[PDB]
Amino acid sequence: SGAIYVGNFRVVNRHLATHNDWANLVWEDSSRDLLVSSTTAQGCDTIARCNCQTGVYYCNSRRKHYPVSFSKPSLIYVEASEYYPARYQSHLMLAQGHSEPGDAGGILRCQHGVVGIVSTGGNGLVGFADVRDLLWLD
Amino acid sequence: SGAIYVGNFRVVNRHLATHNDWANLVWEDSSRDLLVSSTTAQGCDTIARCNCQTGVYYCNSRRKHYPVSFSKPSLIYVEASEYYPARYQSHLMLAQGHSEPGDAGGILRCQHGVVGIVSTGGNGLVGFADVRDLLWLD
Ligand SMILES: [Zn+2]
Ligand SMILES: [Zn+2]
């Protein structure tokens, strides 16, 4: 539910992908924590064609939507976790905000449509993986 | 595009239905100017489960969305047109607003989802056919 559905695509955190995701793989990138898989049914979401840097996301741990201001996508060194070794993550946008394990998957939106998806968190920051350059999705 | 798509339903003005609409008929009611037909693909709209009486609709002739205040659904005598004889139309909600032939089909929405669809117009009023009682749709 922590997925973007655009066209015949389902976009998820790569660390959260299901076996069925991999069985219907379209595209994946560890350095971004993104995986896209094929769908049978047409999705309801649109990808934002803008450079907005404020928006609203869904926080899973709080079950609320929050307004947020987030930095332009950058290369960020992200510490080791149970999902990845310490590595450079690209396309990562950071906001001051509540963050708990399980928040990954939460969808970030602006008036133009979907901006990104929660991927990282810690130290009082929420990191969203930007999807706006993925023009092939829409 | 002047259609509501909810579940596997397509909801249209009955006077605008296509032959394919009738070939896949689920439900229709002349007294409301509504027709619902079957779809292959899951729709993106939700029906408003509320009694809101202000909202926004799309005006076809102006190609703009407009904010509107509309009366509670009533039985309204509607004059003869090329589509119906003079008759009582039920479930009809009226707002002061721009209206031209071709505006029928425009979708009215509030924060809870889809409220109604433009059905009538004239004398400085826009009449929307309420769909909120159609709970079987969602
Ligand atoms: Zn935007
Ligand atoms: Zn409402």
φ and ψ at residue B22, rounded to 5 degrees: -65, -35
Ligand 2 centroid, distance to A83 Cα (angstroms): 42
CB < 8 Å to A44, chain B: 44
**A41 and B44 in contact by Cβ < 8 A?**
no
- The count of other CB atoms within 10 Å of the CB of residue B134 is 19
User: What is the distance in angstroms between the Cα of A41 and the nearest Cα belonging to chain B?
Assistant: 7
> What's the full length of chain B, in residues?
138
What are the phi and psi torsion angles at A23 (to 5°)?
A: -65, -25
The distance of B1 to chain A (nearest Cα, Å) reads 15
Residue A62 is given by DSSP the state: T
How far does the CA of residue A44 sit from the closest CA of chain B (Å)?
6
Q: Which chain A residue lies closest to B45 (C-alpha atoms)?
A: A44
φ/ψ of A30, rounded to 5, equals -55, -40
User: Considering only alpha carbons, which residue of chain B is nearest residue A8?
Assistant: B41
Return the number of CB contacts < 8 Å for A and B. Answer: 5
- Nearest by Cα to B69 from B54, B49, B84: B54
The token duo for A14 is: 């790569």
**Backbone phi, psi, residue A47, to 5°:** -85, 130
**Which tokens go with B86?**
């003079």
| DSSP, residue by residue, chain B | ---EEETTEEEEEGGG--HHHHHTEEEEEGGGTEEEEE-SS--S--B--S---EEEEEETTTTEEEEEE-PPPEEEEE---SS--SEEEEEEEEEE----TT-TTPEEEETTEEEEEEEEEETTEEEEEE-TT-GGG-
Annotated binding site of A for Zn(2+): 50, 52, 110, 112
* Distance from C-alpha of B126 to C-alpha of B44, rounded to nearest angstrom: 25
B119 alpha-carbon distance from chain centroid: 6
In the block, tokens 């995701």 appear at: A21
| Nearest to A2, CA basis, from A63, A68, A52 | A63
Residue A123, exposed/middle/buried by CB under 10 A (0-12, 13-18, 19+)?
exposed
Which domains does chain A possess?
A: 3-44 (2.40.10.10), 45-138 (2.40.10.10)
Which residue from B minimizes the CA distance to A43?
A: B44
Measured between beta carbons, which residues in chain B are less than 8 angstroms from residue A41? 41-42
Residue A10 CA, ligand 1 centroid: distance in Å: 20
How far is the C-alpha of A121 from the C-alpha of A104, rounded, in Å? Answer: 8
Partners of residue A5 in chain B, C-beta under 8 Å? none
Which chain A residue has the Cα nearest residue B8?
A: A41
Collapsed DSSP state (helix, strand, coil) of residue A82: coil
Distance CA A8, CA B103 (A): 32
CA nearest to A4, candidates A116, A120, A119, A130: A116
> Taking a contact as any Cβ pair under 8 Å apart, which residues of chain A between 6 and 45 contact chain B?
41-42, 44
As a dihedral over the C-alpha atoms of residue B118, residue B120, residue B124, residue B126, rounded to 10 degrees, the angle is: -20
CA B2 – CA B44 distance, rounded (Å):
14
User: Tokens representing B138?
Assistant: 């969602």
DSSP, collapsed to helix, strand or coil, labels residue A104 as coil
Q: What string of H, E and C letters represents the secondary structure of A20-47?
A: HHHHCEEEEEHHHCEEEEECCCCCCCCE
Between the CA of A125 and the centroid of ligand 1 the distance, in Å, is 21
Sign of CA dihedral A44, A47, A49, A51: positive
C-alpha neighbours within 13 Å on the C-beta side of residue A46: 8
Alpha-carbon span B76 to B58, nearest angstrom? 22
Q: Residue A67: helix, strand or coil by DSSP?
A: strand
Which of B24-51 are b and which e, b meaning 16 or more Cβ less than 10 Å from the residue's Cβ?
eebebeeebbbbbbebeeebebebbeee
Please answer yes or no on whether A44 and B41 come within 8 Å at the CB atom.
Answer: no
